Design a protein around this ligand. Structure first.
Ligand SMILES: Nc1ncnc2c1ncn2[C@@H]1O[C@H](COP(=O)(O)OP(=O)(O)OP(O)(O)=S)[C@@H](O)[C@H]1O
Ligand SMILES: Nc1ncnc2c1ncn2[C@@H]1O[C@H](COP(=O)(O)OP(=O)(O)OP(O)(O)=S)[C@@H](O)[C@H]1O
Lengths: 630, 24, 122, 123
């Protein structure tokens, strides 16, 4: 035959026990049955976005025919899947393809209409082997489709339907559109209960029903491209795979320490100054201790919701995994941890620590982004440093953040360069700078330093960002900002803030500067911002702490240069008295440090004077501070 | 006894790109 | 390469797929330049590699491993959502400095065997 | 009134070339109403106006609200109302000379609502 050589029976596969259990979807399978029992146009197409069970609708109809859960006219119908690549794959000569296809047609006509043809990927029916001698299989099925002779079940995607079928009008009326809806969440739960039984008996593991309902809710929550019930299933199967690797080999922390100790063993072999044997000793001791603890319980045999959280955190980036104790104990000290790079300004430090704790605890607003802040302070009191300290806490990295400074955006133009050009224009297929780089890594920090410089109607983009956290670039798609931490820094009233931070409380200062911002913004915008903090300048103690931190990073640079240098404690007082001005904050301190330390230091190092390893002190002169060699 | 082989016949297309302009 | 005749590419690719089904779940497939696999067999009225691999992918019965640049991913795979959901995104970040030093300490032996010279570890 | 004309002449409201001239507010949606020049993306699908008249040479063309358009669309309408022919991007020519080219506008709305009293129709 030809049906033996170009089709695959689905009902055979359903009777041989190969196909999945297919749950729900009741109205669309009833409607596919309705379209298949006609006189002309026996041809349903299953339109839905890619991943919503269209192949599962067809294979479930096949299973219902096998179980006899169908009406009477469908009993005995062999549902056949056509392989169109099988038809194309041999017609090297002219006319061989059409012989193949018409032999298929004659055998289907001989089968008395008892075969429901299923063509997966109906966009691969146009362009099925046309050439100069074009018959295409579209212009051959078409008088057999229109006369209802052929019961072709289509299954095509939605953006492929417009491109490859609705650019051929005589074929698009042969088929009938069954708009498959993406399911709900509870329907996804039921679908995962049937497929729970399937993936349990495959991966030899067990899936608790909270792991299912957690996979459903969280994959609805935290994934922007893919759809239910695809991504839910993938989380379940990958959690099962991870548990199978845990059960087969050893737990993951054993593997972390094992690969790190073999790494450091290779590196200490490669050291043949070290500062490596301490780390190897720590890791080998801890690996032996945790191996003994694994022998004590001789870590899992099931799949829980925290497992789904581990996979979803390894899936997007967003920290949904439940708190290990190192992370949580690091997280409690967040107010303390910021004050190793931002000394002073306790207001927004405590505020932002509260914000990220509201995120990690789980009480965030799940429709609005985490951080919606408006920093306000005089020039050089660490606003940009507070945000870079946030990047350093949150990603172990200083310069890993989205810094889109409005200081280029001084016109209504540059809305385009944050959300991409609309179609037909120049950089259309490059997207926005912002929405691309939030579609890559959703969990991040948007930073808008010098936010008042922009033309005042750029912020309407941020009306969208703070209402819902969805932004629509030029390519029509939505990039979901509901994990981003939007921070804006300005100085709209810093004369007033340097003038009246004394003799007024924090509350009335926030009140008055918020009135100033209301003069500079609109009530639409400022009603979105969660907390608009006020920053004060930095007195002498903060200046001394900043001087200490900058001399720490100076010694930290000079350690690779190889010069461990001390300081006079009086020289700190000379830096304080030579860097003190309460109108510019902390940068005159830094450039006074720059001059009055580095210029004798770079003078004497470039002099051919200093040898590494020497005890070097920053002794003072009567006015100078010089480096001595001891 | 030769059989005329059906070809592959690779094709081509293009695409323009507009450019708006501010009008100060 | 060898296919200006109709169906000759699809012949090869189906024969490859039937061999991979024949190997009984023992062959891991690696496909470098997955964005080359997208526009692969684009002849006039021809399937690409997407329209032929796309059955065997989401039945699990092929063990492909893609390897693509992220800018090639946007233009060549995110433009085609069907093959875009068949894979699993694995972000491979640029390593930080210290781990890169470790990797280069691993690779010193290869260059010492190649150029017969030594390298200062500083 | 334009719907009444088409629903007299062809006995359907939408049996007419409705061209909504407030979609053409760019300079370059003349590509929509005339066609794509050759080799470009949608070349072998003509325009909307030019195709739909070369199908049916007797029909009523409603350019709806012409005054919202980008002003170098009036070049195309100059050629139409000059001689009833038009050169689309596929090289051919259209015979507009059996069509009714009705445009709408309201550009004196304050003025007409002001002085329709106490002024005759000529003034
Ligand atoms: N209602 C359902 N009942 C049971 N399993 C389902 C259901 N909907 C989807 N599935 C399963 O979820 C997965 C859906 O993948 P597919 O439906 O094959 O992808 P798709 O929906 O066909 O979109 P394309 O065309 O393949 S890109 C398969 O494992 C199906 O078995
Ligand atoms: N509390 C602080 N702790 C540590 N460094 C600080 C502190 N306040 C300011 N700095 C210094 O401030 C410098 C940069 O401050 P920025 O935040 O960039 O200034 P700013 O707060 O952005 O104000 P403007 O108006 O934008 S210049 C860095 O070099 C830091 O050393």
């Amino acid at each position: 035959q030809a049906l033996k050589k170009y089709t695959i029976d689905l009902t055979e596969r359903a009777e041989q026990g190969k196909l999945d259990p297919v749950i729900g979807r009741d109205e669309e399978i009833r409607r596919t049955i309705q379209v298949l029992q006609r006189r002309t146009k026996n041809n349903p197409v299953l339109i839905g976005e890619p991943g919503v069970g269209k192949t599962a609708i067809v294979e479930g109809l096949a299973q219902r025919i096998i179980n006899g859960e169908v009406p009477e006219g469908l009993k005995g119908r062999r549902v056949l899947a056509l392989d169109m690549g099988a038809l194309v794959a041999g017609a090297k000569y002219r006319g061989e393809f059409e012989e193949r296809l018409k032999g298929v047609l004659n055998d289907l006509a001989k089968q008395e209409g008892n075969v429901i043809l299923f063509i997966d990927a109906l966009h691969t029916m146009v362009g099925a082997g046309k050439a100069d001698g074009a018959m295409d299989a579209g212009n051959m099925l078409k008088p057999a489709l229109a006369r209802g002779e052929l019961h072709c079940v289509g299954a095509t995607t939605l953006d492929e339907y417009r491109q490859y079928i609705e650019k051929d009008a005589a074929l698009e009326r042969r088929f009938q559109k069954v708009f498959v809806a993406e399911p709900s969440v509870e329907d996804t739960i039921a679908i995962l209960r049937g497929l729970k039984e399937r993936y349990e008996l495959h991966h030899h593991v067990q899936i608790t029903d909270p792991a299912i309902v957690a996979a459903a809710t969280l994959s609805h929550r935290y994934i922007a491209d893919r759809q239910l019930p695809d991504k839910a299933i993938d989380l379940i199967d990958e959690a099962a795979s991870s548990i199978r690797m845990q059960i087969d080999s050893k737990p993951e922390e054993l593997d972390r320490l094992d690969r790190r100790i073999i790494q450091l063993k290779l590196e200490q072999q490669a050291l043949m100054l070290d500062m490596l044997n301490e780390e190897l000793s720590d890791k080998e001791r801890q690996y032996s201790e945790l191996e003994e603890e694994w022998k004590a319980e001789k870590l899992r045999n099931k799949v829980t919701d925290a497992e789904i959280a581990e996979v979803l955190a390894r899936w997007t980036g967003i920290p949904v995994s439940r708190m290990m104790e190192s992370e949580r104990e690091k997280l409690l000290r967040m107010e303390q941890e910021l004050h190793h790079r931002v000394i002073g300004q306790n207001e927004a430090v405590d505020a932002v620590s509260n914000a990220i704790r509201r995120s990690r605890a789980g009480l965030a607003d799940p429709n609005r982004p985490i951080g919606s802040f408006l920093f306000l302070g005089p020039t050089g009191v660490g606003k940009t440093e507070l945000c870079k300290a946030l990047a350093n806490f949150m990603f172990d990295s200083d310069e890993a953040m989205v810094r889109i400074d409005m200081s280029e955006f001084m016109e209504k133009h540059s809305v385009s360069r944050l959300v991409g050009a609309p179609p037909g224009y120049v950089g259309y297929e490059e997207g926005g700078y912002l929405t691309e780089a939030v579609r890559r890594r959703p969990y991040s920090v948007i930073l808008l330093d010098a936010v008042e410089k922009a033309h005042p109607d750029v912020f309407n983009i941020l009306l969208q960002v703070l209402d819902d956290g969805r932004l629509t670039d030029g390519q029509g798609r939505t990039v979901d900002f509901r994990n981003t931490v939007v921070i804006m820094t300005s100085n709209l009233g810093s004369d007033l803030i340097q003038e009246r931070f004394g003799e007024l409380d924090y509350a009335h200062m926030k009140e008055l500067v918020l009135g100033v911002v209301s003069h500079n913004f609109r009530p639409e915008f400022i009603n979105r911002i969660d907390e608009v903090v006020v920053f004060h300048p930095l007195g002498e103690q903060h200046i001394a702490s900043i001087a200490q931190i900058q001399l720490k990073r100076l010694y930290k640079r000079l350690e690779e240069r190889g010069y461990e240098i001390h300081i006079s404690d009086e020289a700190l007082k000379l830096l304080s008295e030579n860097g003190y001005d309460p109108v510019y904050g902390a940068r005159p301190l830094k450039r006074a440090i720059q001059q009055q330390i580095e210029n004798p230091l770079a003078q004497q190092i470039l002099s051919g004077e200093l040898v590494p390893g020497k005890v070097i002190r920053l002794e003072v002169n009567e006015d100078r501070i010089v480096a001595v060699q001891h | 006894a030769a059989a005329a082989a059906a070809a592959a016949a690779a094709a081509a297309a293009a695409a323009a790109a507009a450019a708006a302009a501010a009008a100060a």
